[PDB]
């Protein structure tokens, strides 16, 4: 019927005078251009359609040839950064606008999706589809008493755009536009599809990645409970950004991170720096490494809810990256920690995983775990206990790690085990 | 306290999605 036209059939259908054969060309193109198999999208661009496209989505009187021109310029625009281009220069952006106010929901949803990918290109895109008037459209789409009366396949489609306006940095959004989405963000995080959830947790993950003034504007909104509910979802779609708005959060201020405290977070990172998925292990680790980089109480929290224990385990076993972010745990908790929280760590068997974590290639992690070895002889120190210390890294193969290290490459690994076996080794 | 760089990857997932047949 509309299936498997040629391009030169789809132009000469275009190009005839006849809306119907208007119609017919264009959701051939639509076809051509929704199948998986290498989409002829730039055989579509070359021959000229886009303009042609966008100018069927101003035909309020023929809106199925508003849809079909809809559907395939947001295939268009899901390709690379040049063919979303080309879709921004035939003038799209207002042309969806406009639409999103149409009266048939498959075509405002349509023109919600498009918006989607064009913001989603980076930021320049994004800040345009933004300067166009896109959010309060958008938001006005969402201004019902009950989220659930929406279609659940719109109501995505519109979360995950919205997600897209909060996405990318360099620079971050304009901040009266993260202003003017958040309330509506915060209802969304509390929706019950897991999709909604999902993305509406990647948009505060997205909004929270940056300067400690763009986390005061999420934390002032009081989401951060409901973060660590989700934080303690059985959908790993969901546990991932909630995990990285919480990470993100606490590598603010120190009162921010209390708040994440506050809130419980810390019962659930048993499982997080267990978890059978990589990644979830690194990240929670990075997480724990910016609390432990805060206050002593705050150091005193997760000595309470049994974590030390868990970092040590990660620290002895885990993929390479966890382990580093573990080593920075260990750095920052002896950097800040009382010398009865490091006494704590030691107990907790830290030692003997940080020493073997010397034999590592990686020379950032080595000066890593230097500078918490010497952070614990010095903690040593103010109880004149140094020598069992020394005993202690003796006995697990340390100091031959050290000794070898003053052989090393790199300046502050040679200077750091030099000092080190001077002052402790000799 | 480390965050993520301003080249990091914010999300593994690409921002952009094709509406297939």
Redesign the interface.
Same mark, same amino acid.
């Given at each position: 019927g509309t299936v498997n036209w040629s391009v030169e059939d789809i132009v000469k259908g275009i190009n005839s005078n006849n809306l119907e054969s208007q119609l017919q060309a264009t959701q051939a193109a639509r076809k051509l251009l929704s199948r998986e198999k290498q989409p002829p999208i730039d055989n579509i661009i070359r021959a000229g359609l886009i303009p042609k496209f966008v100018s069927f989505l101003g035909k309020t009187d023929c809106s199925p040839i508003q849809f079909e021109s809809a559907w395939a310029l947001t295939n268009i625009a899901s390709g690379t950064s040049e063919q979303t281009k080309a879709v921004v220069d035939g003038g799209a952006i207002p042309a969806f606008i406009s639409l999103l106010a149409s009266p048939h929901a498959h075509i405002s949803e349509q023109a919600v999706w498009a918006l989607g990918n064009i913001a989603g290109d980076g930021s320049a895109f994004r800040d345009l589809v933004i300067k166009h008037g896109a959010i309060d459209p958008l938001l006005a789409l969402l201004a019902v008493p009950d989220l659930s009366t929406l279609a659940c396949g719109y109501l995505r489609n519109l979360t995950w755009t919205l997600s897209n306006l909060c996405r990318n940095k360099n620079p971050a959004p304009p901040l009266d536009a993260v202003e003017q989405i958040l309330p509506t963000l915060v209802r969304l995080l509390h929706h019950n599809d897991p999709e909604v959830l999902a993305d509406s947790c990647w948009a505060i993950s997205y909004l929270t990645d940056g300067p400690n003034e763009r986390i005061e504007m999420v934390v002032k909104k009081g989401v951060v409970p409901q973060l660590v509910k989700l934080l303690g979802a059985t959908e790993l779609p969901i546990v991932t950004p909630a995990l990285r708005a919480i990470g993100n959060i606490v590598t603010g201020t120190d009162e921010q991170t209390q708040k994440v405290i506050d809130a419980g977070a810390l019962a659930v990172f048993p499982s997080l720096l267990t978890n059978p998925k990589t990644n979830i292990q690194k990240e929670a680790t990075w997480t724990m490494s910016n609390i432990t980089a805060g206050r002593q109480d705050q150091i005193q929290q997760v000595v309470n809810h049994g974590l030390v224990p868990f970092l040590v385990g990660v620290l002895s076993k885990a993929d390479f990256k966890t382990q580093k972010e573990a080593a920075w745990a260990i750095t920052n908790y002896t950097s800040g920690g009382t010398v009865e929280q490091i006494v704590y760590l030691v107990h907790c068997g830290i030692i003997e995983p940080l020493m073997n974590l010397l034999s590592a290639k990686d020379t950032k992690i080595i000066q890593v775990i230097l500078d918490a070895i010497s952070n614990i002889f010095q903690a040593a120190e103010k109880l004149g206990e140094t020598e069992k210390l020394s005993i202690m890294i003796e006995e697990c193969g340390g100091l031959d790690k050290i000794e070898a290290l003053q052989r090393h490459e790199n300046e502050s690994v040679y200077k750091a085990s030099l000092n080190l076996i001077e002052k402790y080794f000799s | +306290?480390? $965050?993520?760089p301003?080249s990091?990857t914010?999300?593994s997932t /690409? /921002? +952009? $999605?094709? +509406? /297939?047949?």
């Open positions: - | +306290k480390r $965050k993520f301003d990091s914010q999300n /690409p /921002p +952009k $999605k094709n +509406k /297939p047949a």
